[PDB]
């Protein structure tokens, strides 16, 4: 897709596999979106147990951010930033709007997280 990110989900699966999974999820849940969430390269943070998420479309990016902070057990003092196609998304946007504007040809929205505000730093 756009951007210059690297996601292990894409390293691990060819496009045809990903598109079949993403299309299936999109069809089955019209009011939710499929999202891949992974730690950015070099980020000094834990990985999630799962990297595929089914997210309500009206959940805001901000609320999703708080959920991921909890999943990786961050302390309040710890920094964390989301990146989508190399841009930190606004917290007031809905996940559905973020999905519409950024999802890739395999129908997944890809979100990276890092303790740094520059992707890959």
């Amino acid at each position: 897709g756009p951007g210059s990110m690297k996601f292990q989900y894409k390293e691990d699966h060819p496009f045809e596999y990903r598109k079949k999974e993403g299309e299936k999820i999109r069809k089955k849940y019209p009011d939710r979106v499929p999202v891949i969430v992974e730690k950015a390269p070099k980020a000094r943070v834990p990985d999630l147990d799962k990297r595929k998420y089914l997210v309500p479309s009206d959940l805001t990016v901000g609320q999703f951010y708080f959920l991921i902070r909890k999943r990786i057990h961050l302390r309040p003092e710890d920094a964390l930033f989301f990146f989508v196609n190399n841009t930190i998304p606004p917290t007031s946007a809905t996940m559905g709007q973020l999905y519409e504007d950024n999802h890739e040809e395999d129908y997944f929205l890809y979100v990276a997280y890092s303790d740094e505000s520059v992707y890959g730093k």
Binding site: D49, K50, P56
Partner: peptide
């Protein structure tokens, strides 16, 4: 479970 490779977000 069959399809538990995805985390389903609810409130």
């Amino acid at each position: 479970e069959q399809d538990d490779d995805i985390e389903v977000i609810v409130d």
